[PDB]
Structure formats: structure tokens, C-alpha cells
Design a protein around this ligand. Sequence first.
Ligand SMILES: Nc1ncnc2[nH]cnc12
Ligand SMILES: Nc1ncnc2[nH]cnc12
Lengths: 209, 209
Amino acid sequence: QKIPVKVVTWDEIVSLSTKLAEKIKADEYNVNVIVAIARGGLVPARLVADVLGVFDILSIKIEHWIETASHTPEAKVKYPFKVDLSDKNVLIIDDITDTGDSIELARKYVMENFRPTEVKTATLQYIKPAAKIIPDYYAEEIVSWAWFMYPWNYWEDEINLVNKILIERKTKDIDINELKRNFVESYGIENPPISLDKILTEMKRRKIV
Amino acid sequence: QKIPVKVVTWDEIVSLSTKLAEKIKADEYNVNVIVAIARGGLVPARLVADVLGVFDILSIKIEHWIETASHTPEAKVKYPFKVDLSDKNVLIIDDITDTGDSIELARKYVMENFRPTEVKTATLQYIKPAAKIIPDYYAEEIVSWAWFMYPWNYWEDEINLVNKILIERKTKDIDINELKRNFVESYGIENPPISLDKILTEMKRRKIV
Ligand SMILES: Nc1ncnc2[nH]cnc12
Ligand SMILES: Nc1ncnc2[nH]cnc12
């Protein structure tokens, strides 16, 4: 019932994004167009583009669906479109390769619909034990599964982590102090980037509580 | 010949992005889809999405062209596509409104090709004196023109700032100490986020020097 959670800072994102770009430099892959996987790849896409000198970034939104009875997972491009990237070297970017389901779909999608000369894949992180497909480049190998909390995800991640606690509670409990204590117990996070009272307020606004 | 340059940190981006989101919360605009203007809007787009709870982000790349003899400016969507966003509330996001040429184009483009129920515009910064169009939301009003150096633009911006200095001189064996001095004199930057020796190396790699 504990979940391993790792808080990632902006300094780490800069550091990881730069290291990722350096691998691509060293490999002398000449990137013309970066395709970001939305939403997780937008930020790393931009930073890699800055270091490598890539002017053209596009994005595709990938949704993840689960069938209730079978527990079957399915990944889908939402708002799919076509453009002509023939004559271009494409780099697909996302934040993390977990199962590898996302970069697998992105790669197929891009090859069929953008028809680029070449395609490669890159993510900041790569979970060795979990990944069915290995991205062509990654900045950091992860050998033990954890949930990575990115700085562009602090609100949503904390909202979901709070929710996971609240639905266990047999009797409602507003004592923010209980909530904070559980957060430490369950997630190992003594100081959430966004304070839990702010998270609660926002959950109310959204009609989540 | 001096250029007013403002270095923007990540802490400022987080702060600005959040303030921008708060204005949108307060205004009770219910955003379904964020359309980011690439490349400048990708990062702010992501952060705003996190704070507001928006799952769908798309992007359009906007180029800026200048006619040599006439000095006529023209902004153009590159790799244009169409998708169906009817029944959706769209928020278009960019880093800065300078002339306003970009958000003007984006807005027209989006209404004509995505066909959303409603469209609004947002940027982190807005230059009052320069802007011919005004974004619906902005985090910070700028009353005196400056070049804003964003954290996702440090390499490219510094490369261009270095170049502007090098073309004034004839003597072609680059003195780094001279270069650093000029950087302070021309831009007011004593401590560039990326060290100029790294910038120079990268300019070489790209065949810029
Ligand atoms: N392990 C993980 N951490 C953060 N984001 C993810 N998205 C999919 N898997 C993830
Ligand atoms: N004044 C400015 N600062 C940073 N980026 C820009 N892009 C267009 N105008 C800009």
C-alpha cells in the first residue's frame, strides 16, 4: 500500500534534459523535427530542442485507456492529424519510458502519418524492469519502479496521491494533519512541492471533493 | 547598440505560470483544450495545464519571416493541420506578447481550422508599448521593451547574443575575456546561465563560427 514516489526538481529536469541532448550530439543524429508526446514530453522536448538547435517541434496527445472487466490497457492518439515530414529526421520525445506502450504507439503513428526519412525515440527516464521497448536515447536508467513526480505535474500528481488516501478512510477526516502524516507514511514525502491545503482547495474547486 | 536583456529563471516561470493560471481560474473560463504556440508556448502551456487540470494540449509551430528589401514582416503556421475541436473551449498559450503578431495569427488559424466553441489567449508576459493585439490573460505587464531570455532558450539566445557582438569586429581569433566584457557592456549580463566557452564550442559544432 506504500507507493515509491520520487520528487523531481527543475534543476534535475535541466540536468537530465541536457544529458539526453549530449547523447544525441555524441551520436551525431541530425534532428530536423522533434515530435513531443503530449502532455509529458512537451517540457523535455523544448529543452532538448534548445541544446541541439532544433526549430521545429510538433506534438501528439496520447491517451491511455483501460477496459474495466478485462483490465486490458490501450493507448490511443487523440485529435490525430497528418503532416508531411518526408526529407526530415524526427526525434520523438517523452518524459519517461515505463511500460514503453507510449513510445511504441508514437513511433508507429509517426512513421505511418508523417512519413519521415528517419525516426528515433528519447525520454528523460527509462525503467529497465518495466519497459517492453527501450528508447534509442535516455538520460537516466531506473532499475527499481517508482512514480516520478515531475515539476510540471506537481498539482495533478498530488491531487491523485491525496485521492488515493481519502478513498481508504472508513470515516471522513478533515484533519489536514492526518492527511500530511499519511502522505509521509505512504509516499515518503515530508514537504510536498505544493502544500496539501492548496491541493484540497483545488480538489474542491474541481468538484473532486 | 546596447540591448536591454532580462534573464528569467525557472522560479520566475513557475511563479508567472501559476499567476496566469489563477487569473483564468478567477475568470471561470472552463478550458477543455490548450493549444500551445511552438516553440515558445510549450513550457507555459504544460504548467498552466497542470494548475487548471487540462488533459488535452496541442501545438502549432509559428514561423516569422522578414522580406529583405521591404522589411515586411510575416508570420506563418508551418506544418499546418486540421482537427475537430467543436464542443471545446480552447486556450491558446505563448510565452510573450511582443508585437502581438503571433497570437493574432494563432487565433485566426485556430478559429478557421479547429472550429472550437470558444477561444481565448494567454501569455506569461505582455509588452504594453509594443503590443498591437492584447491577450485575454497575461501574468505580467511589461512597460519598457526588453528581450526576455527564458530558461528554455538560454543556449539559442546566448548564441545569437554572441553572434551580434562578433559581427561588429573584424579580428577573428576570439578573445573570451573580451567577449565576456562586451556581454556585460552590451547586455548587462555578468553571469550568463550557460558559460560563454560552452556557447562558443556549440557555435563551432553548428558551423556558426
Ligand atoms: N512511473 C511513472 N512516473 C511518472 N509518470 C509516469 N507516467 C507513466 N509512468 C510513470
Ligand atoms: N521581447 C521578446 N523577448 C523574448 N522572446 C521574444 N520573442 C518575441 N519577442 C520577444
